[PDB]
């Protein structure tokens, strides 16, 4: 019967352009009593509840009710009457059907001023106990939504109040704010939704954060209202109250004693559920606490409080909040030094999980102090931590960059212990790239040449049956190590290493049976050819031999264009082919090896190749 | 300073604290100024043999007088948290003989900081026992038994803080459990005040507050309830080594009671209370008699007391209740199935909580469709009443899609940020130290609407704004719910009316595809097709379509093939 009455009235309003009542609104109230009576009938007699057609009928009824409400001259009472209508039951909001009408209610700049009147009887709906807590929570939604909409996409309270002209609800808010005494009768009167006190806290935060200078006679009531919330026992309400009182004492009206009290209450006993609240609270409170603590010279105890609480809950999880307390502002620091040993020990204890991104931001703090200057054991402590972290495995590259800048401001061979062995080899190679580059910075890498020679002997002979990344990433540190201004004035110390690496290229180019031995010779011959004009000129014919093998297995990858799997191991052969081109080409002192080399070059021009190195060989023919 | 060099830092302060009012930095702050954090692999014993006589002579004095506001309580708590910070590998008995004499003195008294060493010093002796066995297992465990015997005197004197978390579990337990059974039963199955039965005369239902102003102190109930939640957490471990006996039907009423009278002024205890509840419900035989004695009706939003901390305990409690409801799946008749889909569709359409809980609720309704089909196949008389249930849950799926589509452009705004916060976070990666693409050319060429957004501008944010991919969450929701919809719409084929009224020449084509629906079911199907066609705007470029949009178009096409 309810569905029949609803779609009969919906048909009668659809067949006309506007309301058949011509915005009278007497059958719609009859439909409202119809809905209340069928809800009471379905609640008393338990036959068949919560249907499809009941929900669709209620949706159609809300559609026609809110269609009539946007088509009237008194829109202020029947909206709140509709909020009364589903006090007992029937959802919490018509999602994007009632809230869309309220988003129409929030007109920009209140030109018509109907919304100001709505806010007036809205807060009269809030203070009067004419409904349960859920519809007063929807009243929170509409009131705080239009307030922060005027705050956000306009000036912060610049259109409603200009010279205390028409406040018209702020005195009702004074009457509301004055009742907070005796815990706003929270204990005396039982309210089971705690959204009401959070509504009031957020409403005060709107007034504090929006414009605390045009209003001056309300501020004692504001601070006593936001201070009565401190003495509760819950956690999120307590930290929201801490956040709003730090908003106020960061804005203006600064006291002397209790700002240290709310500071030490902020940085003590904060568990997991309120981390973002204390982050915002400290980030708002501390830049004015620094400038109002240093108004007198000798008070600097607000670093001593952080030190006392940091050594209080030592080596625990709650210290991490203080560990990135000192990281988000940094210019209020580089005035203490026990902080440095504290954070070094903390990152060395927290590296062994998922909080590694914390510890790097600890280390990125330390360098920011060092560049602020422009101890001793802690230097080798933090460099040992950095080396152990980068060889333990984005942010590792940040660790690389910070160690590279930190060395120039352990210094012994530790990498003899470095499956995952190839990954440790690559990370060791990335470490020794710069840790050999950043010491003895006058091209003075010759004293440790036997030690680093025995260190790298187990990875210059790497690619015999394993991956290419070891040689492809040790190539850079070999390219740094084999530039030592040559051997013409110094003793023959780099020269046995040169003869050793050239006989290694020789003995790895005698192996031509698989596609693993051909990479080591061409890579190390290329770094010898780049870093020295002299190379194995009596032994250039194995380079021609491997070049011909590269041509004859380019014949194997000629009739396919690409590989189905293992695609990298063809374009890396093309890459070392571009290497071997220039390597066997830039010296024209060949003997009988010129004509087969040129016939292979002509065969390379013959068959279908890629253009990016055909242009290289026509530039080479231009040379 | 990781050696004996600390001793000359307090060799002048090696004497005891005389005039303890102003001497707050002499002897007690040795683990507080600098000498608390330095490395000590085997560097402790160079001074650890000086800490034990010094702290021993500290603990010889400073008696049990607790009422005065710290003439001596400061150094008492100082040596207390010195005792937790020290980690040792040797000389365990010099620690152990000098700590028991204070915990054997504070058995019946717990008011005004009266003996709060115990919840730390018994844990430190537990830690030293877990380092290496000291064959002292029948001496220290009697004190908590005398605490349990003191609790009748404690409840008669109030017309607490046991903290039994690791006090009875030692991970081996080669002892008896009958004394543990009696010490649990002496306080579990009792009315904890003498007033909780007389508040059940107003039960017609539930109590939001703990007590309506019957006890004047109002802090004993808070501590006693906290201790009861501690013990209700800790007897779960006992179940796995040995089966518990002498009572099996006494846990559900105390579970419902403790869920009803948790205080709204705290939220920590509800976490391990729900953890103990799911640790009960993770078993095989304990989860059978529990749904009968709660009647699946005290498992509602009474478990959130105070609506400013029933926003972090939502996914835990909803996941445990849904996991248990999926675990039984055979005890449920149709009325409980109606009652649980009526609340879990509301959990699905609730926008205030996370996406994973909504996906879990949709998964729960998909797990219930088999029980609905089997119950409808049992008795055909309620076979229409089952079929309408299958038009409720998929209706909520149609609503959930709708709740996404109205946010469409708003989602796009965050996607714009998800471009820039990605685009500035991948071009900081090309600053690597790698080569063979630069030194090669160096060597060569040298010789040649704000509607949903209003929540994000509140001054009390209480949670950081997310930076996850909104389109990935939208595709996850659409793919999961459309697979569920394909399953349920195919499963609706068993509730066809008999084809003798339509008297078709081929009933073998019937009961496979062709069926009937009401008006309010084909309206739901029309809105489902409408919302699924609208929802393909999230997966445009931002017979030429993307892969995820093509997959969802295959789901939408296959979903409507088995409809009549």
UniProtKB/Swiss-Prot annotation, chain B:
It is found in: Nucleus. The gene is TRA1. Essential scaffold subunit of the transcription coactivator SAGA complex. SAGA acts as a general cofactor required for essentially all RNA polymerase II transcription. At the promoters, SAGA is required for transcription pre-initiation complex (PIC) recruitment. It influences RNA polymerase II transcriptional activity through different activities such as TBP interaction (via core/TAF module) and promoter selectivity, interaction with transcription activators (via Tra1/SPT module), and chromatin modification through histone acetylation (via HAT module) and deubiquitination (via DUB module). This is SAGA complex/NuA4 acetyltransferase complex subunit TRA1. Component of the 1.8 MDa SAGA (Spt-Ada-Gcn5 acetyltransferase) complex, which is composed of 19 subunits TRA1, SPT7, TAF5, NGG1/ADA3, SGF73, SPT20/ADA5, SPT8, TAF12, TAF6, HFI1/ADA1, UBP8, GCN5, ADA2, SPT3, SGF29, TAF10, TAF9, SGF11 and SUS1. It comes from the Eukaryota. HEAT repeats lie at residues 2-40, 46-92, 94-131, 135-159, 245-283, 363-403, 479-519. The modification N-acetylserine is found at residue 2. The C-terminal domain (2233-2836) is essential for its ability to interact with activators. It comes from Saccharomyces cerevisiae (strain ATCC 204508 / S288c). Belongs to the PI3/PI4-kinase family. TRA1 subfamily. Although strongly related to the PI3/PI4-kinase family, it lacks the typical motifs that constitute the catalytic site of PI3/PI4-kinase proteins, suggesting that it may lack such activity.
